A paper describes a structure:
Among the >600 human ubiquitin ligases, UBR4 plays a particularly important PQC role, being an essential and conserved E3/E4 ligase found across eukaryotes. Aside from teaming up with various ubiquitin ligases, UBR4 activity is linked to two specific cofactors: calcium-binding protein calmodulin (CALM1) and KCMF1 (13, 16, 17, 20, 21). Our data show that the evolutionarily conserved UBR4 complex forms a megadalton E4 arena, in which inward-facing ZZ-DZB domains of KCMF1 act not as E3 ligases but as substrate receptors. The architecture of the E4 megacomplex is conserved across eukaryotes, but species-specific adaptations allow UBR4 to perform its precisely tuned quality-control function in diverse cellular environments.
To test whether the human E4 architecture and mechanism represents a universal PQC solution, we first reconstituted the C. elegans UBR4 complex by co-expressing CeUBR4, CeKCMF1 (ZK652.6) and CeCALM. The purified complex had a molecular weight of 1.1 MDa consistent with a dimer of trimers. To explore structural differences, we determined the cryo-EM structure of CeUBR4. Although the nematode E4 complex preserves the ring shape of the human enzyme, it displays notable adaptations, particularly in the dimerization interfaces that result in different topologies of the ring-shaped arena. Whereas the domains aligning the N-terminal ends exhibit different, unrelated scaffolds, the C-terminal interface is sealed by distinct interaction with the two co-factor proteins. Most notable, in the CeUBR4 complex, CALM1 is absent, and its binding site is filled by insertions in CeKCMF1. The necessity of occupying this interface in the absence of CALM1 suggests a role in maintaining the structural integrity of the E4 complex.
Residue numbers in the entry:
A (entry chain D), C (entry chain C): 263 to 282, 314 to 354, 376 to 501, 506 to 515
B (entry chain A), D (entry chain B): 2443 to 2689, 2871 to 3173, 3181 to 3383
């Protein structure tokens, strides 16, 4: 069928629950309270593995059959919208036919060096604009070390502030519906036929 | 007959004995279906024979009011409704020959310090069922009309101070109560109490305005209005509002309870999936509105793979279209799909409520009697606190209360002195259509013979914060001694902006003013005075009353009075019809036929400069004005109007060969020629007076008729219907002229040859 | 059927073609050239009838079976529109039910004299506004005489100007479609198989 | 094989002999069906053998080009189309081994001083049939590419000076010709001719703008756009445009001619009635738009009683509605009715044309041969001079010609120096959507490395005469050395107005700029410099380049850089998704993962102040950024992010009993708790590294896990799906913690007891 298009296109779902020279510590890490508290909780091999993972950077490279109430794997599903605004119906494609010869909206001719420089400058400006939005401006003494950079960025928030002495959670009240009884029944009946003649 | 009356008395008293005894016996133990059935038949039996003798039933009810009130208050819906109807029959059906109905109403109000009536009002007046709300509205009306002053006051204060706060988050369920309060508060409340109520309603209006302005209802309202889905679908992926959408085996052992728990667990997943699908559809609806591509994907939280498959199968549209359904059909299909999903969500919510009710009944209410009323947990499952419709309805209730309180001078002063209340109300009315009418009405009340308020509202209209339509509404009510200022403002705005809406409103107001003169006598109508133009110019420019017009604060634009005649040939057909109707109405007034004829003759020259598709209303108006009467025809003939018409026809025929050779020009030529020929035929045809006119004026149109008929016959391929009609009418005129004057036709033919 | 309304209501059609003390002339009429010309065209009874008519004032008091191409009586058909604007759907009728008791939008209470005075003043202002729109402001010495008023209103337009010496109308050109013949046929054929070997 | 080649050559030349002889013989006398049938078979036979040896056919065609050109020019459509295809096969299909194709193209162009090619172009290139228009477009392309310089110039001047004026009033029929001119004029025209053509196109643009502004197309366009009928129904009661709507016995004696005349007479009445009905429907459509009642009646001219009965029967609607089709269904029904009437009018027009053609053929062409082409009187019956679509199409043709001429310096100067041409083009693009795209493209061409033009367009955008989207388009093309100014303007407008469209456009542009970095190597990407905030502040406030930022003409508002983060929780979901996509893209850049983590942690606190329905995209972005890599998980764990998450969970659980008891509050609580628990589970689950992290960090979350699990398990009636998911995940975490550390769990339970 050539007159039917896909205007709402689901993409691949990202699952939420996953399916289950030497490197030495710096001077700041050895003085860090949480680090020493960690060293007394696990073995030395585990600490070495944690440190190696910390200091390293990852090598970056129809029909419906499932029921609504079915159990499965939760995830995030992205939807792409290849639709046209209703106000733009029948517009914007006057010269869309490939058989036309006029030079249409093609990209300009640029050398490799100039293109790379322009791309890098545009990315730099965009990154500066986004980075200025942080409430606390981060200062990076050495950005090639990931742990140091993350520490410098996040150390002022005091994420490690332990919750205070915790108490028992007060239970949330439940939904109860007890129909009201007549107080007379839960505890003199006049003779209606006596008077009134 | 007295024996039968005594027998009926004993029968009803024994029936009520039976009703009370059986109600008590059923309430003793846990009842069943059969337990309340005979109660229902007993109630129906007393209902059937009660309307035979309503006065005696009133006496019986007044003797034992407390028992009936308790029965209505505590039993289930079936019993309580019939008992309430019995009370209404006892109260209203009497002929109020004495004070007995007054005593009955007083006993109902006073009973148990008003606890019983308060419970009845709380249960039925603001309940789910609309019929019971109307029933209690009628009962309250009767009781309030039929009670003493102190009891009336007690009941109204009870309705406002206690019942009204409970209906705060129910949109349309509090309509009847608000109506009763708005009707009876100004008569039984003191000035201080009215002022306090006005202040409370102002605070409620401000709170709702902040809520509407804060949660982004305006943009989403605009989105739903532009797509044509309507304002009732503001948040269709939300948990449904039960006010606006009105729409399991009895547990015995623990295994069935576990099954019910599992069913609830599955239903939660189903509801979540349905809401996710609705969210996806809402994102698509938003994408149809925004003009920017390649807009990014929207990510949803899903519990399984059902949603992805659903949108794979159903996420399609039709690129082929049949004109002019290129937009209507896809939107209709989208509305159908969203309706199906929303209905499914509503049924799921109802089933969840039923399941939880059954679990609660098994857990706790397994031994309660079936005769007692079972409350429904509606306040927990109803999301009315963030429903656009319910918020607008509560705003309407507050506006109604303010309008009702405006009759007090102190309350009116408080309303007028509030911090920019009028501007806020105007902006609210402008933004949302649902609030526009009633708010406008309140403004009309504040725009009474007060002049400063009118000046403030006019300044706000000039700024662009209040629609001009308010003024138009204010002009539709009489007995207002400040109508001249508003009329001046409307006329000036129509004269300046030349917008279609302003012109249409001004023309309709003027036409109504002219039409209203049919309600008086002819002697009054004959007293209209023909003032010169300088008087109306002074009235427009300055700020004087009409009777005083016999420094230039306001300045008129370039020639301003022509606007009306421009409206006679407007591109908007509603404005065209309005202006032509106004001209016809002017033609029917005293001493004003010459004015309409002069306007017609002056604007005749526009037929050659405007497309003929715009002139049609003017042609109809001209036909009507000329066909007003035979005397008008004779007067117009003596002024040589037929000579003008024949000259126009001659000029039109002589210039055909200069025009373009295409269908449009021929259509325009035919339409203009048809108008002229129809006017000439109407002038010269009719009764014997028109025959005399044709006979007298046949010397100056015979040769033109003959040659135009020949010229129109010479056309073979450029033929239109209007040209054929014109040729036929001209032939009729020529044939009727030459019926008894063949010598003149022969002489004319010889002169032309 | 209670769920169907009439949103477009035709009205009655006005047909276009109609179905076929003494009163003495004033001094201006006797001096009018057109009146003298009329006096020499018809009898005296006809002139008396015309004068009487001129000087007097009228006493003012489903299924489709007709085919599109049918012949009949032309006329003007007015259509009334009892429709609702789409932007106002489901609005403006919150208290429209007749069972409500609040005093709704009713007219104010006025005595007969005050109402008549107000109506007359409003009509006067409307008439003045409409009358100001004429290009030539009319002056009425006596508005109770209809002929005099019409003459005073319309005499400056010179409606009686006769068309000049009329000539023969030039006929409009007709639509002719004559296919273009080949000029060769309307008046040496090479031997294709001779050469080319 | 040479014998076979000679036989084929003789056969083809003999077939051409028969073709010419039979064509002449048939043209001698009035032919019939059988007269051209064998001609058609001869053409088919010579075609079927032509593709076998295209070079020999090319030679034969080049020898006798004039006869084939004459046959294509003069015969009917069936013969002419085949002859044109034969010529195309002869020209294109050769391998251009030598100059033979050049000579063939030159002879085609030069033949009879170009009369034959001019006639062919006039007949087929701008004809009714689109396939033949494309065929002639291809033939002209091949001839122009394959010819000499002088012949190319002659052909292009002929196309522009002669053929182009004829297609003035045909909307889409002149598209191919305009395309050819726009492609080949700048290469063969002199500067003076290009300037003259530019001036002519500017004059055409001004004339069309005056026509559009004068006949009231803007208001009626708005009316049709607001009702959803579409811009293609601007005047549906008008005589149909034949370009935009593509869709009798042979007279022998005078009686049949009289019957044909009577049929024409009846058809005129039928067409008039149909147009009157369409006018009534148009008046109803207008009434659905205007808000003022009791708007007056509209009067139509009728020829009979059919229209009144039609509107009595069909003038109904449905008050009942199924939500949310309260608007879509009536509009769809109205569109269906108008479509039916319009189709009937189109068929009536076609029938009228056929009847007049038959009458003309009988009167005059009763003896002409059937082999000659029969012209159709389309220019008379086509009302394209007042068609909105055709006017817009001709405007698009002029815009394309201007864009093609912009390559010349003198033409560009003339365009820039015209009287407010840029402002007029911007206003035209803003008013009508059909013209928006292409006009914008031309503006982008005028907004090249020139700076003054950019300043003028920016001033016009600030005034409100040109849409900001133009700049966005200008930012989608590289190699422009003035992009910084436009980027500054867009960023400032998004920062100030906070309109949904401006924010969406700015966010998409920034996201594209960030995504473009995947096209370069890692060494180039590692050269990003982390400049302080003062540099970007100076860039925004002043008018310096980026490299120079290392008097304050422009002033920033209150804290301006927060806008992006505000967009992370916008009420418009498109803006929400755009901002979150931008954040995820930032997370993937060099040395910028800590920045994204800091933004995430700073905005985590907003989850308690905003409704959870708005935060969902932020939750997805947080999940993605945390799940970027295992090393990120370890680094975040060492910074004690899990302690923060467990504190948030504890605080959320402890404050439940303070919240209102309704469905909405429980849903929000469940969603927030689910987000926190999912983040914690993602942090602590995965590979062996995450198992080590969970083992190391079990002392500071065990008791919280236990007590939160108990608290969630204690809920029975206020259950949501999110709460169940959170409970299940917490139970999984607790079970996995206590699998091999039961002693710690026992100690914790003892401490809690
Ligand atoms: Zn609601
Ligand atoms: Zn068209």
């Amino acid at each position: 069928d050539p007159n039917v298009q896909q205007v709402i296109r689901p993409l691949a779902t990202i699952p939420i629950y996953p399916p289950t020279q030497p490197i030495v510590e710096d001077e700041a890490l050895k003085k860090d309270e949480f680090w020493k508290t960690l060293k007394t909780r696990i073995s030395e091999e585990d600490v070495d593995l944690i440190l190696e993972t910390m200091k390293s950077t990852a090598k970056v490279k129809a029909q419906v059959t499932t029921t609504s109430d079915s159990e499965g794997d939760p995830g995030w599903l992205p939807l792409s919208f290849e639709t046209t605004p209703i106000r733009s119906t029948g517009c914007g494609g006057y010269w869309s036919d490939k058989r036309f010869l006029r030079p249409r909206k093609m990209q300009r001719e640029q050398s490799v060096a100039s293109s790379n420089a322009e791309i890098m400058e545009k990315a730099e400006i965009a990154l500066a604009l986004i980075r200025a939005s942080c409430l606390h401006e981060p200062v990076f003494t050495d950005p090639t070390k990931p742990d140091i950079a993350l520490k410098e960025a996040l150390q002022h928030l005091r994420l490690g502030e332990k919750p205070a002495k915790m108490m028992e959670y007060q239970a949330a009240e439940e939904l109860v519906n007890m129909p009201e009884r007549d107080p007379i029944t839960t505890g003199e009946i006049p003779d209606f036929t006596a008077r009134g003649y | 007959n007295k024996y039968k009356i005594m027998r009926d008395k004993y029968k009803m008293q024994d029936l009520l004995q039976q009703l009370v005894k059986k109600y008590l016996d059923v309430s003793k133990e846990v009842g069943g279906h059969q337990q309340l059935t005979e109660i229902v038949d007993v109630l129906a039996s007393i209902t059937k024979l009660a309307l035979i003798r309503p006065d005696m039933w009133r006496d019986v009810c007044s003797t034992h009011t407390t028992w009936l009130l308790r029965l209505a208050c505590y039993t289930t819906d079936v019993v309580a409704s019939q008992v309430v109807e019995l009370l209404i029959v006892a109260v209203r059906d009497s002929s109020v020959g004495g004070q007995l109905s007054i005593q009955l109403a007083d006993s109902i109000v006073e009973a148990e310090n008003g606890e019983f009536i308060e419970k009845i009002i709380k249960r039925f007046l603001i309940g789910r069922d609309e019929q019971l709300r109307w029933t209690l509205h009628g009962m309250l009306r009767s009781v309030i009309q039929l009670a003493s002053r102190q009891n009336q006051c007690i009941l109204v204060k009870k309705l406002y101070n206690t019942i009204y706060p409970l209906a705060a988050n129910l949109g349309v369920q509090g309509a009847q109560l608000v109506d009763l309060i708005a009707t009876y508060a100004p008569r039984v409340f003191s000035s201080t109490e009215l002022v306090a109520m006005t202040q409370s309603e102002i605070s409620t209006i401000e709170k709702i305005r902040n809520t509407l302005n804060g949660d982004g209802y305006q943009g989403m309202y605009k989105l739903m209005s532009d797509l044509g889905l309507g304002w009732k679908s503001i948040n269709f992926d939300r948990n449904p509002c039960l006010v606006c959408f009105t729409s399991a085996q009895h547990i015995t052992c623990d295994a069935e309870r576990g099954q019910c728990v599992q069913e609830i667990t599955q239903l939660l997943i189903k509801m979540e999936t349905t809401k996710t699908k609705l969210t996806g559809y809402r994102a698509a609806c938003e994408s149809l509105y925004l003009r920017n591509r390649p807009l990014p994907p929207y990510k949803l939280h899903v519990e399984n793979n059902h949603t992805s498959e659903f949108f794979d199968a159903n996420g399609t549209m039709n690129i082929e279209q049949l004109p002019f359904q290129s937009i209507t059909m896809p939107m209709n299909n989208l509305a159908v799909a969203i309706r199906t999903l929303h209905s499914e969500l509503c049924q799921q919510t109802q089933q969840l409520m039923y399941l939880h009710e059954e679990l609660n009944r098994y857990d706790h209410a397994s031994e309660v009697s079936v005769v007692f009323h079972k409350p429904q947990n509606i306040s927990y499952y109803s999301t009315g606190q963030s429903c656009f419709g319910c918020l607008c309805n509560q705003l309407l209730h507050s506006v109604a209360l303010l309008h009702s309180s405006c009759d007090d001078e102190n309350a009116l002063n408080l309303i007028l002195s509030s911090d920019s209340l009028i501007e806020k109300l105007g902006v609210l009315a402008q933004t949302y259509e649902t609030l526009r009418e009633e708010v406008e009405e309140l403004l009309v009340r504040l725009m009474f013979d007060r002049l400063d308020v009118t000046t403030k509202v006019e300044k706000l209209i000039h700024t662009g914060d209040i629609n001009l339509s308010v003024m138009v509404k204010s002009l539709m009510y009489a007995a207002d001694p400040t109508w001249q200022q508003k009329l001046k403002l409307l006329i000036r705005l129509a004269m300046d902006k030349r917008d279609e809406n302003c012109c249409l409103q001004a023309l309709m107001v003027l036409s109504k003013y002219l039409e209203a003169t049919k309600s008086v006598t002819l002697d009054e109508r004959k007293k209209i005075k023909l003032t010169p133009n300088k008087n109306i110019t002074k009235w427009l420019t300055t700020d004087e009353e009409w009777k005083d017009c016999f420094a230039p604060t306001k300045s008129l634009p370039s020639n301003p009075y022509q606007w009306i005649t421009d409206c006679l040939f407007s591109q908007w057909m509603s404005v065209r019809s309005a202006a032509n109707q106004l001209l016809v109405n002017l033609s029917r007034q005293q001493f004003h036929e010459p004015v309409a004829l002069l306007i017609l003759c002056e604007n005749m020259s526009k037929l050659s400069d405007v497309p003929s598709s715009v002139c049609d209303q003017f042609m109809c108006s001209a036909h009507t004005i000329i066909d007003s009467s035979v005397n008008t025809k004779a007067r117009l003939f003596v002024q040589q109007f037929h000579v003008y018409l024949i000259k126009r026809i001659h000029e039109e025929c002589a210039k055909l060969h200069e025009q373009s050779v295409n269908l449009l020009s021929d259509n325009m030529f035919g339409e203009r020629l048809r108008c002229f020929v129809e006017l000439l035929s109407l002038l010269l045809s009719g009764s014997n007076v028109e025959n005399v006119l044709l006979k007298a004026g046949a010397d100056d149109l015979l040769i033109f008729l003959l040659h135009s008929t020949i010229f129109l016959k010479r056309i073979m391929t450029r033929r239109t219907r209007a040209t054929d009609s014109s040729r036929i009418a001209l032939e009729k005129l020529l044939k009727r002229v030459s019926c008894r004057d063949g010598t003149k036709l022969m002489s004319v033919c010889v002169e032309s040859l």
